[PDB]
Structures are given as structure tokens and as C-alpha cells.
Design a protein around this nucleic acid. Structure first.
Ligand SMILES: Nc1ccn([C@@H]2O[C@H](COP(=O)(O)CP(=O)(O)OP(=O)(O)O)[C@@H](O)[C@H]2O)c(=O)n1
Ligand SMILES: [Mg+2]
Lengths: 69, 49, 228, 231, 210, 230
RNA sequence: GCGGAGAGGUA
């Protein structure tokens, strides 16, 4: 289990819209419109989206550019 | 109480040296052992859960 | 209690849970339901005396759903005096109050399993089966008289598998001594409409024990009720 | 370059209590072997014990017979303590039939060949009436450890007869284990130790067999250790 | 009277509702736990997560229809426990203790299925809850929606709340056994076994002590 | 009767001397009995080779100072304790160190003998300063079991020896660190089973897996006299 | 058989 989200909050310092972007990503992941960019280790889609956020691949702007594309 | 403990051939201080059942090693500083009257109260987890 | 205060006998005797001799004598018959004592000639009434009989109470339900059981203390042929303790009530032994049980404790922190006021216990305690209590739940199925027609207690119950009936008698009530589990049908009832629906009582979810007793109270005084 | 322990004199103080000695123990292995065996003995010694009982006139554990003073539940509690040795079969059916006034002890059980009643004086019940008669059929199984009724309920396997009375199974003969590592003066050596294991059991497993089986179990687990896949 | 007053309304039914997917049980020590987890009874976990169980059962095809899923949960076969383990994996639950005095009275944990009927609470967090293992009980809620899960794991999880919101100081400080053990371990004695020997590191110190 | 055997030996060898070993599923309670037996045998009774005594050509007592070595004598003793050497045939052999010039006198600088191999040639021993830089010593290494502190031998030093023979603690056992955790593990129906995680650090000579191997081996030879069900 | 009174108890 991912015991700390400290690096994800260091990516976006509000610590609140972090939850929103991670929820949007994990909702695009659960209802299978999209695919994970990280090799999953039997995590559920919430911890997958946090693991993706902490690695710098996804934020709000990447979501907006990919959605309009 | 000390007298009664002596009559039974038990340590007068009421503490005994105990061995750890997992490791087998002795505990430093002997520990108080003895019989105490305990009660099971009507608060049963299976009723609470 | 290995360490008491002496008040144990006062409390046990003065409470009504013990069976105490009224006229001292000699124990004539001992059973796990009754103690029959032949009175001594001193205390023996001249006219129309007879013997003394103490019926004991076996597992009954207390207000809190705990068990109320009396055990005999005395054996055949032992002499008893007026005011001695014949039978032990619930949580009393030989006349003394035995609220709980006395076990070997050691005061030490054992890898934080007794961290806060929590308690660590050895499997030997469960092996010797010394903290196992008997509890007793009461359940009631009531068949009233509706204006659409009286409901029935019969064992013919709509759309139930014969698995559920297997443990039911022809009258529709569980056998004494049957082991039940949550959801099993305690008694068969049909709601008049005539049937197709069941108001039959079931064991509450997640409680499982043995049916020790069943009672039937009928204002109708019907001639032919089996359980009755 | 090692030494190795050989099983030496096995003193029997009582029928249940026994002292077993192991003389040539290397320095440091006294406590190691003492504790390992203590653990194995207390946890894993296979024994036989009563699993369920059928008495005639009794529907459930809570009823009562005429002419006895114990409740049926106390009779089961007494049976749990019954120390028995089964030799060949895994499940035996013992039959107890007694009449008349007197204490029904374990000796009154119908004597079968393969079953040994270790403590015939062990009481079961007390009759109190001339015409009062108790009959029961006790089913005894072999097993290891401690298995309660409520767990076996998952595997009910047609418990349908209401006459059946389930008993908690203490499938374990060893009651107590203590060990002392003490200086073992060997005629040509300075510092060698001897392990003395004092054990109290219900008198079914013999000491030699207990120690041998415990060492066997520990050795099997060690076998599991010898190979290491790393694949 | 229905509107005004404590028992009546706004307080009672409009700020004080009574949620679903919630449970209650006695709390217990569970020292082996990680700071971010909590021992949750199997049977309670199954009861709480029932609809999740049904969804996962239908996805794998183990059950044709929803009623068969219900029957399979009500028998509780090995497949059901496997599905429960799989769904519970990253799903966090909220633990609350009756007087939720401050925001640390509610915290999120990852549950670990255990036998028994008592909830196992990590010792270090007891100070935050003012929890004591003397019959205290705790309630356990399940965040359902995806947004709730992110909020529980990010904002509310136990490990994210180590400093008290009131003052900056740590909340998770060791309480009594831990501090006693550490104190015993670190205090020195004038003369003992191995007085004044020189060690190449802590590793041989443990070699020596053990 | 029929027992439950461990089905897996997961081994996570980070930093070759450091090995984590996982074992599941194990019968109830056997986690601690087996883990501890192994731990104790490894720690207290393990055949190895180590420096026992040393003779410095220059200093007579452990508190004296040698000119031009910044490290104190105690530092040199601590560095000598860490030397992990494996000798093949001989029981007790005496290695010589003779160095001059600036820099760190390391284990490689020992005279290279036939049967004796020093697993860590780069282990620092001393630091020598300028223009004098004279270090000469004779270190005696012996084979033995377990850990033997200096104090117990120096106690029994009635065999009076000439001065400069400085005793060092003998670290024979190759295990530097050993610990075991037992944790819950269930085989799909049985929950009262446990997993054994053994964290082990050895001193280069033997890798941890094989160390564990010979530990379990030793315990089996001792047990051999009783075990006969096969 | 949703509710509400009264009594007792838990933390
Ligand atoms: N009528 C009540 C009685 C108790 N409580 C609550 O239950 C807990 C008992 O504390 P407590 O005082 O019993 C034990 P603690 O606070 O940890 O101190 P100690 O262990 O050193 O003795 C407290 O959190 C109280 O807020 C309540 O809401 N209403
Ligand atoms: Mg409390």
C-alpha cells in the first residue's frame, strides 16, 4: 500500500486539487476509457493514479491537453 | 503475606524469574506472578460487533 | 476467590440463588434436579410432618439472558443442618460467591499485546474452557386472530425447501435439542391472505445455539396441539 | 568437528511425570534444544481424545438424567479430561454402561483390546438411585493440537442425530515441560552440558516416543531449510 | 418541538445523519500493524463491502446474476474470501471514536483482514483518538465513491496526520510501553557484563547482547 | 500426524552480504521456535576464523600511542576485528603486516600467503603520516566457534606472557547481524499459520543463504540421534 | 412493528 502521498502534494502544493486531478485520472482509468502509464503491482486504480502523479507523468494540464487532443 | 509465602516455599518478595516462552531467554529483573481473581464482564465483543 | 473478604457466604446465602435447607436433617435423595431430605426427629413436626423436598432450577433465562442453574453440593447420606447450602446457584460454589475465576497472572509488558489496559491470555485458558458462559435467548411467535382469518402454526409452509422442514416436527416447531443457526426456521407460520406467504419466526441473524425448551400457551385450548 | 547428544536414562517418577536426560550437549546447544523441544512438545504432540458422546435419555447438553447429580454438561466436562491411549484405529467407539448407586468412573468402560484407559479411577458421573442406569457411547479420535466444536461445525457432515453431544477436543497429551541445562562432567572434557527435560503428561504418550517425535518434527522442518531454491 | 431542540431536527436529522456501509466493534492492540493500517474482522469486512463483492463476483463470472452473488456471499465460500481480499486490497476505511473531539478523531486506514470480532487499532494513533483498550469501541465507515477514496487516502489517512492541527507538535508520540522499553534500553549502569569493551559498530553490539 | 511443510523460499539478496529470506506457510508457533533455533546457532556457535591476539613491535599497552599514526591503538584493534579471513588447512596462522609511506594501510597490504584468503582486500587498517610512516605488526588468526571476548581470555592469562602481546576480541562466527520476524499468513482456510522473515548480514566470507544452510545442517546433525521416522 | 417515554449500562 502507498503509505504516504507527500511527494504528490509536493507536486501541487494546494494538497486539495491533488485529490481532484487524481480522482479524474482514476475515474478515466476505472471506466476503461484509458490505460495506466505505470506497470501495476496489483494495486487498485486509486493508488495507481497516485503512483502516476508522484512520478510526474500526469497533472491537470496533461489531462486538458490529452482530452482536447 | 510474607509469612504465608514462606510457608509455601515461595519467594518472600512475591516476584519470580520468568522465561520468555518464544525465545527461551530469561527476563532480567524478576516479575510479579501470582493468582488474581478475574471476571468476564457482560460486554462481549460478539454482542458489540 | 483465592483471596476473598469473607462476605462471599453472606452474599451467596442472602441472595436467593442458592438452595438452602429449611429444616435440618439427612439427605435422602440427590439428583441434578431435586434434593430430598428426611427431616431430623427434633425438628420433625408431630402431626403431619413428612419429608422436605427442594426442587432445583436448571438452565433458565435470567433477565440479562444469562443462565441460572443450580448444582447440588451435598451427596447421599450427608447430614445437613438448618441454614446450610444444599445447592449452588449461578456463580456460587459450596455457599461462597464465585463471581469469576482465579488465574495465574504476571505483571509485565509482553510485546505490546497488553499495551493499554488490554489483557493477554494463554490458549490454556480457552483449552480448559474456563471462561465460557452459557447464555439463553427467548423468542416468541404469536398467532393472533385477524379479521381475514386466524393464522396457523402448521408445518405446511409455502415455498420453503424440505431442508428447512427436516428439523421441524409435524406441528411445525423445532425439536428440543436441535442445533440451529441464524436464519433457520424456529417455528412454522402462515399468514392468511389462503397462504403463499410466511410469517414464520426464524433464528435472528448470526446467533446459533441449541433449542433447550419450547412452550405453548393457547387461549383457544385446542384439543390437538402436538408440542402441547 | 562436533559432538552430538545421545538419549540417556529416562527416569519415571510417576505414571504421568517423567524426566528425560541428554548427556553430551555442546556448549550453547543446551538451551537451543531445550527450548525447541519444549515448543514442539507443548504445541504438536499427537494424542487421542473424546470428540462426541451419545447418552440415551438426553436430547442436549443442558438436560438432566434421573438419578445422577452432575448435569450432562458437567459429564461432558469430565469426559474432556478422560486420558485414553488408542493404538491402531483413528476413531474408536467406547461404550459405558453402569447401573445402581455408585460413582461411574472410567474403569467401567467396556474393555476393548486396542484402547487403554490410563486412569481407571477417573470419575465420570455419580449415580444416586438403585434403578438409575446410565449408558453412553463415546467417540474418540486421534489428532494434534486443540480443536473446538464450533470450528468443526463447518464440517458438520450430517450431525442430524439430536442425541449427538459435541465435546471440545484437546488432542494433546503433554501438560507441562521444563528443562535445565546443567554441567555435564564428562570424564575427558572440561565444559560440556546435559539437558534434563521434566515433562508432565496425561499418561498416554510415552517419554521416549514424545522426545523422538518432537525431534523428528524439528528435523523435518530443518530438512525444509537445507534446500534453498533462490530461483 | 420537532424542529427546535437537540432531539428534533437540524441537529438530529440534518447535521447528524446515520450512514450506511458502517460498523462498530471493540478496539484492540495489534502491535504488528503498520502506522497506515488497521485490523478489520473478516465477517465485518464482508458485511460492509457486500456490494463491492457482488460487483467483483459478477465481473469474474463466478455468478451469473445478482441473486446468485447474494447466495454465494451468504454461504461464504472460499471464492468469496478471495474476492474480499482482492477488493479490500487498497480500499481504505474510516475509523472513528465516539467523542470525535478534534479532526484526528476520524482517520483513514488500510484494513488487513483478521479473525475475531474486534477491530485492531495501531498503538501509536491511540493518543490522537484518546483511545484506551479497556472496552472502548470504534465505528468504521467505508468511503464509497472514487472521490471519497482519494480524500481518505490523501487528506485523512493516519500517516498524513502526525502533527496536531492545534499546535505544531507531533501527535503520534509513543505512549507508555514503547517509552518504557526505550528508556530501559538506553539507560546505562555503572557496572554490568561487557563493561568497557570496544565495539566496531551497533551490529556486534546486538551480537553481544542477544 | 501429517504436518504442513513450507512451500516457498523467497530470497531478496540486496547487497550480497545482506539477505532477506521469506518462508511460508508454517504451522502455528513454529515461526519462533525455528527462527530462534537458527538465530542462536548462527550467532553463538558458528565455525569461523578470526584475529585473536596481536603483537605490535612498538607499543606495550593498549593506551600507549604510536608516533605518526593518527588512529589510536583502539582504532587499530577495531579495524583488526573486522578482518574476515578464511583459511583452508591450517588451524592457527600468523600473518605479518609491514608498511611504510603515506596513506591507508589496508588489508591488501598483508603478506600474501597460500591457503589464507582475505575476502575484503580493501578493508582499512591504519593511516600512516609522512616521512616516518613505520608500521609493523604480527596478527595471529585462529579458527573457533562463536564470539569470544577479550575479557574472558585475559582473565585466564595465568600463563604469563612477555609484554606487547595485546589481546583482541575474537569474532569467529561469520554472521554480523541476524534477526527474524514472524507474521500472520493464511492458506486460504487456515489462518493460524505464520511466515518467517530472516534478515541476515554476513561478513563477506560466506553468503547468507549458505550460512543459513550450514546452521540448519548443524542442528540436524545434533538432532539426528532421535529422528527415525523416515 | 417505523416511533416516543421511563430505567439501567458502556467509553
Ligand atoms: N462519562 C464519560 C466518560 C468518558 N468519556 C470518554 O471516554 C474516554 C475515557 O477516558 P478515561 O479518563 O476513562 C481514560 P484516559 O482519559 O485515557 O486517562 P488514563 O488512562 O490515564 O486514566 C475519554 O475520551 C472520555 O472523553 C466520555 O465521553 N464520557
Ligand atoms: Mg477507554
Amino acid at each position: 500500500a502507498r503509505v504516504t502521498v507527500q511527494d504528490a502534494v509536493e507536486k501541487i502544493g494546494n494538497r486539495f486539487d491533488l485529490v481532484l486531478v487524481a480522482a479524474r485520472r482514476a475515474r478515466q482509468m476505472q471506466v476503461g476509457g484509458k490505460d495506466p502509464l505505470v506497470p501495476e503491482e496489483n494495486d487498485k486504480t486509486t493508488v495507481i493514479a497516485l503512483r502516476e502523479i508522484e512520478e510526474g507523468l500526469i497533472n491537470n494540464q496533461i489531462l486538458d491537453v490529452r482530452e482536447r487532443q | 503475606i510474607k509469612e504465608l509465602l514462606k510457608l509455601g516455599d515461595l519467594p518472600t518478595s512475591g516476584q519470580i524469574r520468568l522465561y520468555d516462552g518464544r525465545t527461551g531467554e530469561q527476563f532480567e529483573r524478576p516479575v510479579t506472578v501470582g493468582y488474581m481473581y478475574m471476571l468476564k464482564l457482560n460486554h462481549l465483543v460478539d454482542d458489540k460487533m | 476467590p483465592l483471596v476473598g473478604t469473607g462476605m462471599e457466604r453472606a452474599v451467596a446465602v442472602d441472595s436467593g440463588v442458592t438452595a438452602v435447607a429449611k429444616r435440618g436433617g439427612v439427605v435422602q435423595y440427590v439428583d441434578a434436579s431435586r434434593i430430598v431430605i428426611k427431616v431430623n426427629e427434633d425438628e420433625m413436626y408431630p402431626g403431619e410432618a413428612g419429608i422436605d423436598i427442594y426442587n432445583l432450577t436448571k438452565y433458565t433465562r435470567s433477565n440479562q439472558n444469562t443462565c441460572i442453574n443450580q448444582m447440588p453440593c451435598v451427596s447421599l447420606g450427608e447430614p445437613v443442618e438448618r441454614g446450610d447450602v444444599l445447592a449452588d446457584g449461578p456463580s456460587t460454589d459450596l455457599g461462597e460467591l464465585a463471581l469469576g475465576q482465579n488465574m495465574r497472572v504476571a505483571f509485565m509488558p509482553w510485546n505490546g499485546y497488553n499495551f493499554e489496559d488490554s489483557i493477554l491470555v494463554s490458549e490454556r485458558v480457552v483449552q480448559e474452557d474456563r471462561f465460557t458462559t452459557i447464555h439463553i435467548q427467548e423468542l416468541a411467535c404469536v398467532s393472533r386472530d385477524t379479521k381475514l382469518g386466524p393464522e396457523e402454526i402448521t408445518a405446511d409452509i409455502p415455498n420453503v425447501g424440505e431442508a428447512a422442514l427436516s428439523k421441524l416436527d409435524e406441528s411445525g416447531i423445532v425439536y428440543i435439542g436441535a442445533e440451529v443457526t441464524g436464519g433457520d426456521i424456529l417455528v412454522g407460520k402462515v399468514t392468511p391472505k389462503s397462504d403463499v406467504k410466511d410469517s414464520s419466526l426464524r433464528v435472528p441473524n448470526g446467533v446459533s445455539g441449541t433449542v433447550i425448551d419450547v412452550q405453548v400457551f393457547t387461549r383457544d385450548g385446542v384439543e390437538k396441539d402436538k408440542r402441547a | 568437528e562436533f559432538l552430538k547428544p545421545r538419549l540417556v536414562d529416562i527416569e519415571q517418577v510417576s505414571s504421568t511425570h517423567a524426566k528425560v536426560t541428554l548427556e553430551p550437549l555442546e556448549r550453547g546447544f543446551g538451551h537451543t534444544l531445550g527450548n525447541a523441544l519444549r515448543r514442539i512438545l507443548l504445541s504438536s504432540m499427537p494424542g487421542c481424545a473424546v470428540t462426541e458422546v451419545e447418552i440415551d435419555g438426553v436430547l442436549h447438553e443442558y438436560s438432566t438424567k434421573e438419578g445422577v447429580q452432575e448435569d450432562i454438561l458437567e459429564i461432558l466436562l469430565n469426559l474432556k479430561g478422560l486420558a485414553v491411549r488408542v493404538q491402531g484405529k483413528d476413531e474408536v467407539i467406547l461404550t459405558l454402561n453402569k447401573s445402581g448407586i455408585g460413582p461411574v468412573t472410567a474403569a467401567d468402560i467396556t474393555h476393548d483390546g486396542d484402547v487403554e484407559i490410563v486412569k481407571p479411577q477417573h470419575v465420570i458421573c455419580h449415580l444416586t438411585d438403585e434403578n438409575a442406569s446410565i449408558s453412553m457411547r463415546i467417540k474418540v479420535q486421534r489428532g494434534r493440537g486443540y480443536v473446538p466444536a464450533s470450528t468443526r461445525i463447518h464440517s458438520e457432515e450430517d450431525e442430524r442425530p439430536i442425541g449427538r453431544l459435541l465435546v471440545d477436543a484437546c488432542y494433546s497429551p503433554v501438560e507441562r515441560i521444563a528443562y535445565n541445562v546443567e554441567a555435564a562432567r564428562v570424564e575427558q572434557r572440561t565444559d560440556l552440558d546435559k539437558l534434563v527435560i521434566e515433562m508432565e503428561t496425561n499418561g498416554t504418550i510415552d517419554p521416549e516416543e514424545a522426545i523422538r517425535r518432537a525431534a523428528t518434527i524439528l528435523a523435518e522442518q530443518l530438512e525444509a531449510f537445507v534446500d534453498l531454491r533462490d530461483v | 418541538d420537532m424542529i427546535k431542540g437537540k432531539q428534533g431536527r437540524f441537529r438530529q436529522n440534518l447535521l447528524g445523519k446515520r450512514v450506511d456501509y458502517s460498523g462498530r466493534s471493540v478496539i484492540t492492540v495489534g502491535p504488528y500493524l503498520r502506522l497506515h493500517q488497521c485490523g478489520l474482522p473478516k465477517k465485518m469486512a464482508l458485511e460492509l463491502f457486500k456490494p463491492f463483492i457482488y460487483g467483483k463476483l459478477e465481473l469474474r463470472g463466478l455468478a451469473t446474476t445478482i441473486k446468485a452473488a447474494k447466495k454465494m456471499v451468504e454461504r461464504e465460500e472460499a471464492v468469496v474470501w478471495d474476492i474480499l481480499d482482492e477488493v479490500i486490497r487498497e480500499h481504505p476505511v474510516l475509523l472513528n471514536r465516539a467523542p470525535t473531539l478534534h479532526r484526528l478523531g476520524i482517520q483513514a486506514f488500510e484494513p488487513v483482514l483478521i479473525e475475531g470480532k474486534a477491530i485492531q487499532l495501531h498503538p501509536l494513533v491511540c493518543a490522537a483518538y484518546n483511545a484506551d483498550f479497556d472496552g472502548d469501541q470504534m465505528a468504521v465507515h467505508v468511503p464509497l465513491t472514487l472521490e471519497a477514496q482519494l480524500e481518505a487516502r490523501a487528506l485523512m489517512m493516519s500517516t498524513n496526520n502526525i502533527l496536531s492541527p492545534a499546535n505544531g507538535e507531533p501527535i503520534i508520540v509513543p505512549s507508555q510501553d514503547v517509552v518504557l522499553g526505550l528508556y530501559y534500553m538506553t539507560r546505562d549502569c555503572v557496572n554490568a557484563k561487557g563493561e568497557g569493551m570496544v565495539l566496531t559498530g551497533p551490529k556486534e553490539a546486538e551480537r553481544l547482547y542477544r
